[PDB]
Design a binder for this molecule. Structure first.
Ligand SMILES: Nc1ccn([C@@H]2O[C@H](COP(=O)(O)OP(=O)(O)O)[C@@H](O)C2O)c(=O)n1
Ligand SMILES: Nc1ccn([C@@H]2O[C@H](COP(=O)(O)OP(=O)(O)O)[C@@H](O)C2O)c(=O)n1
Ligand code: FES
Ligand code: FES
Ligand code: FES
Ligand code: FES
Lengths: 797, 156, 797, 155
């Protein structure tokens, strides 16, 4: 009856179906644009047609005279409130509405409020704006030239910024980590040395649901309530309170159901600030919901790193050092989401899964006439660029030594016995077992047979297709937490959970995180189910409402399972401890005299004497034992001691059509190890979504700008997104190496498929050209671009 | 000038007066509060707005409400019957064919019609038959499993 | 300046204006009938036209065919769900919808569901019901006769109820307290004795807003949300969950703004159950809002006690013993709000403000063909009856001895040094100082001069009017709590408070209580303001939402300040202790080296070194000192150690027109001592209101039944409610005798004015007839009834 | 159903109403002006009091159809551009409300009574407010609220 009872809980390890589905499959979900309030008006934004220039004059009369238009605001209406500019997570400032000039195409210049989105759109076209064009800056290198135009005239005369000294007016910062002198020493005398320049293209998270909000200031009650597509509503609440002067307790921010975030909905966009201001001025609700073109064009982008990787080693493949130099294109304003002490995120995790004794990385961010961003799209704070850098370099090293790409990795892997491992960069990898995982994947796909096959096709000068095999062995860093190290605008990156057990046994739980579709309402419930012996079905979890949920830092960078997942277990355990104390009183025995068996406390050596969580709960409200307050609830704010370090071995086989340049993924095997698994069904979905995003990034996505600074391909007409036809069948596998420091040994996983899959595709494409000397080919790997390579290397048809 | 029209949505007559430029998607969402159908783009690619019109799958963001005077429109809010989930809704639930759920209403309406066009679809046919719907979360794998599940339930 | 900072807080002791006024004075309050939900239908009830009889047949077809009507339910539709009967707080069962018969006129027989309240009303008229009239039971005495008709045919054969053995089929219970043997002995040897019979008429709380709700079961999400006029939403939720089978976490009950309670909105009425069942069946929102006649006729009534008081004494006036026997009319079903172990509430508090060595009381509950209730009108669980009795008896004893009514009270008072004083009944009065308060009142009105004016007027046999002086010195007992003795349906009578401080210094607080206009949103904020040095203005308090607020027992019997007030202070003090700990870390000193001064912790000696609560709050979210979790919040469930005993001394002067029987209150002086005062302005309002209810009850309110059991005067046509013209100007005074056991020494006070004023009016009316031998006159003292007595004692004209 | 045009709080409202519809239900259900309340079915309480064509009227005893071409004012319309009316300020300052159920009606009555009698005595106030019942205040503070509003109206 004990095996059945545990199973009936549908807690830890169970592939129970989602609790979220019921509403979503019947169209009863509640997203921002589904919201309608009494007297709600609609706001639309007048955007910049040029990339760089001075604003001569803005014409509001025609728009204002239009029936249904209530107001037209500009930066002039924002100055008196000190809101034409706003603070960013990066420590820089961003324009809410273009004041004296525009820094990027499609920038927010003015807003209109109307009865509905139809009249609003009209009002936007009716607003005429005159500009004086200025020389555009689109390339980071060209941006740092002496004669390069001044973009940020607002910070003219500042010799330092939020992240140290600034050497040029377009220079944002220079950050580094690792031992520089020691690294230079290895490279100065090392026998084997490889160098590779690579560009990680600017891409966009492009969530199906764009950004939006419904701001509502009630002049009677004197308080603001705004529904919003935010991945950190609590942080927004604190920020909105300070910028507006409205006491925080009178500010309520609520993230309802969100149609995907992926990092794109972490920041505060000028659209939100404008709606709030408009709402406060008109004394009524204002809705703002951007269109696809606006989301791709103006919200947080991802990547855009120009990297220079280097590897030093002995002829047998053993790596002695790593040296990296990056130029980061951050756009006009630096609004790149990251902990305040890390302007380049956690890029120093580029040591990867290898025991590299000496390393040093250096990132230099620069301004350009483009939209802000950098951190978004399942990246864990630049881990995507880190993994891509190291794996591409190891492939370069392997090809120079003519060594097998799997063999060279097995040679450099941090051994299982070395964990907890401290890298050349200072990270303390919690746990891992890369060799076992690698062998498993290689056997599963018959790696030697694939090599034998690739050898055969290469032998025939007439083989109509090229065969490429890609292999990535990566280590992720998820769970941004350690408050001494990580903070968002001063707030330590902890998270929380509050559980309240009702008189009848069911419970309500709220956390400081906010799901955007990853299944928190189900998984969180499963964690609590196993900790308290209460079925997950009746543990109602909720997130996103700053007036009810405990304060947290939100969901992004796969921090939920690591941080909130820990707060949930500990809070549950606080309740469990009190439950024992109460069970002891009822059974008239001592505490260490009781045994916990799935969902009850029983007397040791006497099964007939027990008390279930239901019995205890009622007792808690009925008659609290002496020295105990009535009730049965707890809260826990978890400040993590370390990050979580999940890993994976990804292998991909591609066949390239020599006549057209078309690349077809023949097979893709993904093995992920995120420690203790809460819900494998949910984990699998996250893998499928992440790998699909990777295929999107590596095979087709990009955000090209012309000479004049116009963003090309900013709609789904050109911005690549695979359909069921382009998406390959994914093969998944796993191993279980728990995080020792975690309350339930669980590691994050959502961002792993994204981080790891991207370099696997490039590894497969490049491996197809390896036999003719190709060391690297820049993304995206479209038919067009790949054909250009076939042409250049005389492999075309 | 607003035009008076009566649209049959989920078997119920909806008498409204809307400007001719009113896209069906906004009519369903704004005038009727049938906010299941969603907007994911402005170029007719995503399919998050897919509803069933006069027996065919149509992207409501590229169709006028004024062209539906007397039409039979089916939205996600109308798939269930007496509370019992339609095979297609059950399919997406049992097979975990949804995460954020933004493309779901559109996927369901499309799956509902696709399964009538082709009762016994192969995997390739499913992926192809569902090409007008974009999804950012699932990777499509569980979606084809969901459709295969719905297909089987409809034949039993 | 330190004084200025304290004033700036607007906390304990300040007469600050209310935070809840803004919305109410602009019509933006949110009451039950203001709610409109998508697809919301309206419910109306078919009520019994007779007081007792079997149900022959109910015709639903005419109503069902009526356009707009969706459903017509009867008890038959409730049986499958076992909901045609529901449990009561008194341990009995009440019919939700009459099944085999009706037990009282206006009882719920069937319900209709229509598009709106207009069609719904037409549907009730279309529903025809046939009855077989049975003999009616109106008088409690006739109910006990051997040949009295069987009212509760459902209880046939039972020899025991929930409160002991039953001696007759109409007999509900018999309860007693005190030393019977000792008291019987005292009376047998007492030199002076008095016994008086008095009826405390059945009256109704009649809150301006009637009872109602909007029940909403969502078949898609599988959960219930009910907005309701409830004074205890949390227990309602627990009960609703039990009876519905819906897990408690999926049931959400919310008491919004309520237009007054006064104990009328404590119970669960059949209308609520039907709305819920209807909502569950139809799958959509159902609204039910009763009319005034329904409220007066079927919701909880108050009083209806037939009392036989006895007092033993010595020639000089010292009370030796107290003996009381009571017959209580509880209506058809016993749904009398009360702690499970007290079927007669705290009636044993009838020893009053006097040190009476021996006493005993016995209350006999009886069933009659009337609506249920008994406790519901600022009565504190039968304290209204207990006080009326003792005060009436003391007057009778005073008149027999020809002793001044104030002098006999001062002589019998429990002296200040006797507290904590244990009475003959077992209550431990916390504190008091009756003598000082009495002299204070007597002096302010020049009591001696008053008696001389009265003596001079009585001397003239032609005086057109009679002068009467009533004096009442009472002790209340509020704060229903000790879980060992007090519980509602098994739930200990504790209460709670959760306070959460935000990063920027402001806060949100929730309690298990629920205001109905008494000002909790202001007062509760004041308590926390002083405890934490955070201005009351930004401490946002909320109650009533079971899904957000901590579990509590609601508010009635003036339990809020006693129980929740303590939990608020204690939860605040938990936060203050952590804040001290944080301040110590920041200031690099030990806690013991710190001093709290209004809103900051300062180092002993050096004033320049300090940290405000704002500074501490921020630090809690920035980086928690080693050993502490981030955040600054606390929860507290308070199980009170004892009740609170506020006291009062009220005096009233009346002039009776001998020619018409009209009574004009010439003056009323009310002195109340509720210990530490939170907000003098709010306290004054409660007094004014309660005294007014007192005037209404003593001088006009009653609910008469004719021989056939029909309720007479059940609308505002006859049911007395004073206007600004009939309501006299109240004079208020006070003293401060803090409750030693209470965290802030505050006692409840809202129900004191009601409890004390009623006997003060009767004391004044009887005293006007005292010189001709009158000892008592039953309420109401309407002109009709006073004239009747005027003619009887030859004083007319 | 008769089509009517009523000016409510300064705005025209052309609606189709059933003759039996009480003005109070029209105000609350059709226009969602839920400030006005219902406390009885016998016309005593006055919680439904609104100002119609220059006079205080209990909207529960008046038909909406009768307001065709009428000028109606409710509590939602008392404040001017957010600035409270003298009576609203008076009730706030003098703690003239608790549960707030009778408040909208009290304010609408006082708003008219003060124009009928700008300098009323206490007796005149109490008598002038007789059509409004209150269960919480005991009227005493309401008297002070009216006096407070009267002093500011002549300021
Ligand atoms: N060990 C693990 C890690 C994640 N998960 C689940 O996968 C989903 C994504 O988890 P995550 O921590 O990596 O990412 P976010 O939820 O921070 O996006 C969350 O619902 C999960 O609880 C799991 O079941 N087991
Ligand atoms: N000592 C006291 C007691 C009550 N009060 C206030 O008077 C109001 C009624 O308090 P209460 O505890 O007697 O009654 P309920 O609020 O339980 O009806 C609550 O707002 C108060 O905080 C006060 O200011 N000081
Ligand atoms: S909204 Fe994208 S196809 Fe209709
Ligand atoms: S589940 Fe999010 S786009 Fe499909
Ligand atoms: S509702 Fe009572 S007078 Fe109008
Ligand atoms: S304030 Fe409650 S009835 Fe007047």
């Amino acid at each position: 009856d004990a095996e059945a009872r545990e199973l009936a809980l549908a807690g830890m390890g169970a592939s129970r179906l989602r609790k979220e589905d019921a509403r979503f499959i019947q169209g009863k979900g509640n997203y921002v644009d589904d919201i309608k309030m009494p007297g709600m008006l609609h706001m639309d934004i007048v955007r910049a047609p040029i990339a760089h220039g001075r604003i001569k004059k803005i014409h509001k009369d025609a728009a204002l005279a239009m029936p249904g238009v209530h107001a037209v605001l500009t930066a002039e209406d924002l100055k008196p409130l000190k809101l034409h500019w706003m603070p960013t997570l990066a420590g820089d400032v961003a324009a809410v509405l273009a004041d004296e000039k525009v820094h990027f195409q499609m920038q927010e210049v003015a807003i209109v409020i109307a009865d509905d989105r139809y009249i609003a759109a009209d009002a936007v076209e009716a607003v005429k704006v005159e500009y004086d064009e200025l020389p555009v800056v689109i390339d980071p290198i060209d941006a740092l030239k002496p004669d390069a135009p001044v973009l940020r005239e607002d910070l003219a005369g500042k010799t330092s910024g939020a992240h140290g000294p600034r050497e040029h007016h377009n220079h944002i910062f220079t950050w580094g980590a690792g031992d520089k002198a020691a690294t230079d020493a290895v490279f100065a005398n090392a026998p084997v040395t490889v160098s590779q320049h690579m560009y990680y293209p600017r891409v966009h998270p492009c969530p199906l649901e764009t950004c939006g909000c419904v701001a509502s200031f009630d002049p009677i009650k004197g308080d603001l309530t705004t529904y919003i597509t935010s991945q950190a509503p609590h942080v927004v609440r604190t920020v909105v309170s300070m910028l507006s002067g409205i006491p925080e307790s009178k500010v309520r921010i609520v993230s309802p159901d969100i149609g995907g975030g992926f990092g794109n909905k972490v920041g505060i966009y000028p659209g939100y600030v404008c709606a709030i201001v408009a709402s406060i001025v008109l004394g009524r609700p204002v809705k703002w919901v951007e269109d696809r073109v606006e989301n791709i064009s103006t919200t947080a982008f991802a990547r855009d790193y120009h990297m220079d990787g280097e590897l030093a080693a002995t002829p047998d493949g053993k790596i002695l050092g790593l040296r990296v130099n990056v130029v980061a294109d951050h756009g006009a304003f630096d609004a790149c989401a990251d902990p305040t002490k890390f302007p380049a995120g956690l890029f120093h995790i580029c040591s990867g899964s290898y025991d590299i004794p000496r390393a040093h990385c250096s990132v230099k961010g620069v301004y350009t006439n483009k939209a802000p961003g950098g951190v978004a799209y399942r990246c864990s704070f630049r881990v995507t660029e880190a993994v891509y850098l190291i794996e591409r370099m190891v492939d370069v090293l392997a090809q120079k030594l003519n060594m097998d790409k799997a063999e060279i990795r097995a040679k450099n892997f941090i051994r299982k016995e070395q964990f907890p491992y401290t890298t050349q960069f200072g990270f303390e990898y919690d746990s891992g077992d890369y060799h076992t995982a690698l062998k498993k994947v290689l056997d599963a796909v018959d790696y030697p047979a694939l090599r034998a096959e690739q050898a055969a096709r290469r032998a025939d000068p007439n083989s109509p297709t090229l065969m490429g095999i890609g292999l990535v062995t990566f280590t992720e860093v998820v769970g941004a937490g350690p408050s001494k190290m990580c903070d968002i605008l001063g707030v330590g990156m902890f998270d929380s959970c509050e559980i309240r057990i009702h008189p009848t046994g069911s419970a309500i739980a709220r956390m400081g995180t906010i799901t955007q579709g990853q299944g928190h309402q189900t998984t969180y419930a499963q964690i609590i189910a196993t900790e308290l012996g209460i079925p997950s079905e009746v543990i109602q979890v909720e997130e996103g409402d700053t007036s009810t949920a405990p304060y947290g830092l939100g969901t992004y960078g796969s921090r939920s399972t690591p941080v909130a997942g820990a707060a949930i277990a500990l809070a549950a355990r606080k309740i469990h401890a009190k439950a024992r104390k109460i069970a002891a009183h009822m059974l008239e025995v001592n505490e260490n005299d009781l045994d916990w068996e799935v969902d009850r406390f029983k007397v040791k050596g006497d099964d007939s004497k027990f008390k279930t969580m239901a019995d205890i709960a009622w007792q808690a409200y009925h008659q609290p034992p002496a020295g105990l307050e009535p009730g049965l609830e707890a809260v826990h704010y978890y400040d993590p001691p370390n990050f979580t370090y999940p890993f994976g071995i990804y292998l991909c086989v591609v066949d390239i059509d020599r006549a057209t340049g078309e690349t077809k993924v023949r097979r893709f095997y993904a093995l992920d190890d995120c420690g203790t698994r809460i819900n494998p069904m949910i984990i699998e979905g996250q893998i499928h979504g992440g790998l699909t995003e990777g295929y999107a990034v590596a095979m087709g996505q990009q955000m090209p700008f012309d000479a004049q600074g116009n963003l090309l391909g900013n709609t789904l007409m050109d911005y690549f997104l695979p359909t069921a036809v382009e998406t390959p069948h994914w093969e998944t596998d796993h191993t279980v190496t728990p995080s020792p420091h975690h309350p339930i040994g669980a590691k994050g996983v959502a961002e792993s498929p994204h981080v790891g899959s991207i370099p696997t595709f490039t590894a497969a494409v490049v491996d197809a050209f390896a036999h003719v000397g190709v060391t690297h080919l820049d993304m995206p790997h479209t038919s067009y671009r790949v054909w250009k390579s076939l042409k250049e290397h005389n492999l075309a048809l | 000038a607003k035009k008076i029209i009566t649209v049959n949505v989920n078997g119920k007559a909806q008498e409204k007066a809307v400007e001719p430029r009113t896209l069906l998607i906004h009519f369903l969402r704004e005038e009727l509060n049938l906010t299941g159908a969603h907007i994911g783009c402005e170029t007719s690619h995503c399919g998050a707005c897919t509803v069933d019109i006069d027996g065919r799958s149509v992207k409501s963001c590229t169709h006028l409400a004024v062209q539906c005077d007397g039409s039979e429109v089916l939205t996600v809010e109308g798939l269930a019957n007496k509370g019992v989930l339609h095979a297609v809704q059950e399919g997406f639930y049992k097979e975990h064919g949804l995460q954020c759920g933004f493309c779901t209403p559109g996927m369901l309406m499309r799956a509902y019609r696709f399964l009538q066009e082709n009762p016994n679809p192969t995997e390739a046919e499913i992926r192809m038959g569902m090409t007008g719907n974009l999804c950012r979360c699932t990777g499509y794998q569980n979606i084809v499993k969901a459709v295969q599940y719905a297909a089987r339930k409809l034949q039993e």
